């Protein structure tokens, strides 16, 4: 019988398999693995998972000393209850892993932490330190809005803007007299990117990320969709595009990189 445990490691991936080879992977209901998972291959065939896509929440899917559970999704309704139900699927032993489902709206760390203590399995966790952190770092700034509004018409960047904030439009209306307001793209000569609080924070970052294009921006979702600004950071790991974050007070610098950086 194994002790069930969850013990968070500082050795390499490759030391970590003298105690266990098993790796416990997590993939959506199409059998994409979350990208946490996929930085545990080593050039392993992962054709295996693809082969009998879709699956069902909970399926398991093995080969070698790899096993995929498909676990379920915020998006699509999923609770800790349901991310449990489903680790329990997986066979009882010793696996190296990774925190699932911490990705924009996704699971919260001790939601994560609380499916692994319901199963009696014994797992070692490995860092997943935040892709290009060290980067997004660089660009957290604390201005004002009139500081941002000028950075971005003196450098061409996007500026993403939530509409539900009228002190903003105000200003926004004062300054370029017959800006055409409008939920999406608006480009004269300073271009914006409007958005509501309707509008799911993962949403935006999915667009913002598919324009690809500089940004000047507050961290998306803080006070507007109800979001603190530790919640609005979880999400801003997700933005790929380049990007200057402006913080509500320099205080708030430290602290908001401090999230940004976590693992
Ligand atoms: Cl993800
Ligand atoms: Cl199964
Ligand atoms: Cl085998
Ligand atoms: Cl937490
Ligand atoms: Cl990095
Ligand atoms: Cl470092
Ligand atoms: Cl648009
Ligand atoms: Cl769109
Ligand atoms: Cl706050």
Same mark, same amino acid.
């Given at each position: 019988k194994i002790k069930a445990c969850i013990d968070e490691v500082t050795?390499?991936?490759?030391? !970590?398999? +003298? =105690? !266990? /080879? @098993?790796?416990?992977? +997590?993939?959506?209901? /199409? $059998?994409? =693995?979350?990208?946490? %998972?996929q930085n545990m291959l080593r050039g392993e065939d992962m054709?295996?998972?693809? @082969?009998?896509?879709? &699956?069902?929440?909970?399926?398991?899917?093995?080969?070698?000393?790899?096993?995929?559970?498909?676990?379920?999704?915020?998006?699509? $309704? $999923?609770? !800790?209850?349901?991310?449990?139900?489903?680790?329990? *699927?997986?066979?009882?032993?010793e696996y190296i892993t990774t925190y699932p489902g911490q990705g924009?709206?996704? &699971?919260?760390?001790?939601?994560?932490?609380?499916?692994?203590? @319901?199963?009696? %399995?014994? +797992? &070692?966790?490995?860092?997943?330190?935040?892709? /290009?952190? *060290?980067?997004?770092?660089?660009g957290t700034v604390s201005w004002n809005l009139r500081e941002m509004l000028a950075h971005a018409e003196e450098t061409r960047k996007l500026m993403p803007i939530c509409m539900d904030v009228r002190a903003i439009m105000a200003t926004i209306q004062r300054k370029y007299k017959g800006i055409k307001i409008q939920e999406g793209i608006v480009d004269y000569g300073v271009r914006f990117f409007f958005y509501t609080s309707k509008e799911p924070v993962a949403s935006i970052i999915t667009k913002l990320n598919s324009l690809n294009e500089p940004l000047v921006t507050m961290p998306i979702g803080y006070v507007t969709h109800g979001f603190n600004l530790?919640?609005?950071?979880?999400?801003?790991?997700?933005? @790929?595009?380049?990007?200057?974050?402006?913080? %509500? %007070?320099?205080?708030?610098?430290?602290?908001?990189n401090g999230y940004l950086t976590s693992s």
């Open positions: 050795t390499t991936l490759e030391e !970590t398999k +003298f =105690l !266990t /080879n @098993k790796l416990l992977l +997590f993939a959506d209901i /199409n $059998g994409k =693995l979350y990208h946490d %998972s054709s295996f998972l693809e @082969k009998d896509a879709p &699956y069902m929440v909970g399926d398991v899917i093995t080969s070698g000393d790899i096993t995929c559970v498909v676990i379920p999704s915020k998006k699509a $309704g $999923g609770t !800790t209850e349901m991310l449990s139900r489903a680790l329990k *699927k997986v066979p009882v032993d924009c709206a996704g &699971y919260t760390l001790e939601e994560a932490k609380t499916a692994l203590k @319901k199963c009696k %399995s014994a +797992f &070692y966790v490995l860092p997943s330190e935040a892709p /290009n952190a *060290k980067e997004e770092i660089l530790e919640e609005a950071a979880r999400c801003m790991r997700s933005l @790929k595009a380049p990007a200057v974050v402006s913080v %509500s %007070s320099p205080d708030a610098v430290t602290t908001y």
